[PDB]
Amino acid sequence: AADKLEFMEMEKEFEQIDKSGSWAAIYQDIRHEASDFPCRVAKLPKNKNRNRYRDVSPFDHSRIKLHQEDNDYINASLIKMEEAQRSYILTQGPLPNTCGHFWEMVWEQKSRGVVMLNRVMKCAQYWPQKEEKEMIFEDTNLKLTLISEDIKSYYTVRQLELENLTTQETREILHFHYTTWPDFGVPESPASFLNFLFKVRESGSLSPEHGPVVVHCSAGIGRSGTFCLADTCLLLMDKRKDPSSVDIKKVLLEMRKFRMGLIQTADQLRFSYLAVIEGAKFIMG
Ligand SMILES: O=C(c1ccccc1)[C@H](Cc1ccc(C(F)(F)P(=O)(O)O)c(Br)c1)c1ccccc1
Ligand SMILES: [Mg+2]
Ligand SMILES: [Mg+2]
Ligand SMILES: [Mg+2]
């Protein structure tokens, strides 16, 4: 019962920011205040073709390393949210030459789920679209088979089998693909986004029994940042005595310690607030 007033305060605050048209100002404060750490490995000449965008790089301190002697580099970051007790890997959409690296990362990190928030057409077609046309990544010795998929209006869930060809171990990977979230846009609705997030949660993919979920979009910052921020803030609102004590700006700044550029537009920041308030009300209702 105590939560009613807390949610009223959150909704009032949201409405005050809307009325004043202050989302961009708050978003620019976040950009201004965001961490700046070196990305020396990302910038090595040998890695140029491993980055989709020159201007989007993983920090050295939080990058995911491939277990390779040859070249350990992938444009991917580990976001470790200590208070929420959740970790995520945020990565760019695989390139034609980094699909093997992507799946190697999924394997090595022991991930159970991949969350994709963009569409191919960018991003390489890194998973099989037909059961009978499996993919083999010869560079990393991995085989990937589409087992089934469930296509809904705003998202698709695929069951994939990932096989390490060296050991013959197989793992089930769940692919959660939100298909209606344009570059620098927002999801179809808070409801659509939350339904999707709740499906990811329900699947167990986010549990500490597994490696970190792999989340990507095109650059691995805007949509991926929005998704992870909302999830973390929802965790915190459930965990804390007072849900209104969760400061979404503060949480985003924390996440930006681990990867640059998380949340790419003022409207995405707005959306994150809206989705978190609505999701928390739902959960705590
Ligand atoms: O490379 C980019 C850039 C470079 C200098 C200044 C500003 C931006 C971004 C890289 C970038 C950064 C973020 C996203 C994103 F936000 F949409 P995401 O949700 O992370 O895929 C995308 Br798509 C792309 C860009 C933006 C528009 C067109 C092409 C490239
Ligand atoms: Mg930039
Ligand atoms: Mg068929
Ligand atoms: Mg088999």
Radius of gyration, CA atoms, in whole angstroms:
19 Å
Inertia-based shape: globular
CATH T-level topology: Protein-Tyrosine Phosphatase, Chain A
Quaternary structure type: monomer
Order of strands, main sheet, comes to 1-2-3-9-4-8-7-6-5
| Gross CATH architecture | Alpha-Beta Complex
Helix/sheet category:
alpha/beta
Which percent range fits the helix content? 25-40%
What name goes with the CATH superfamily? Protein tyrosine phosphatase superfamily
Count of individual beta strands: 9
Number of helices: 7
CATH class: Alpha Beta
| Ligands present | the ligand O=C(c1ccccc1)[C@H](Cc1ccc(C(F)(F)P(=O)(O)O)c(Br)c1)c1ccccc1, magnesium ion
Largest sheet: 9 strands, mixed
- What is the chain-wise order of helices and strands? HHEEEHEEEEEHEHHH
Strand content: 15-25%
Number of domains: 1
Distance between the termini: 9 Å
Binding site for substrate: 183, 217-223, 264
Modified residues (Cysteine sulfenic acid (-SOH)): 217
Subunit structure: Interacts with EPHA3 (phosphorylated); dephosphorylates EPHA3 and may regulate its trafficking and function. Interacts with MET. Interacts with NCK1.
Subcellular location: Endoplasmic reticulum membrane
Structural notes for this entry:
It is built from seven helices and nine strands, in the order ααβββαβββββαβααα. The protein is of the alpha/beta class. It has a nine-stranded mixed sheet with strand order 1-2-3-9-4-8-7-6-5, sandwiched between helices. Strand 6 and strand 7 (155-164) form a beta hairpin. The longest helix has 19 residues, at 266-284. The structure holds ligand 825 and magnesium ion (3 copies). Keywords: Acetylation, Endoplasmic reticulum, Hydrolase, Membrane, Oxidation, Phosphoprotein, Protein phosphatase, S-nitrosylation. The modification Cysteine sulfenic acid (-SOH) is found at residue 217.
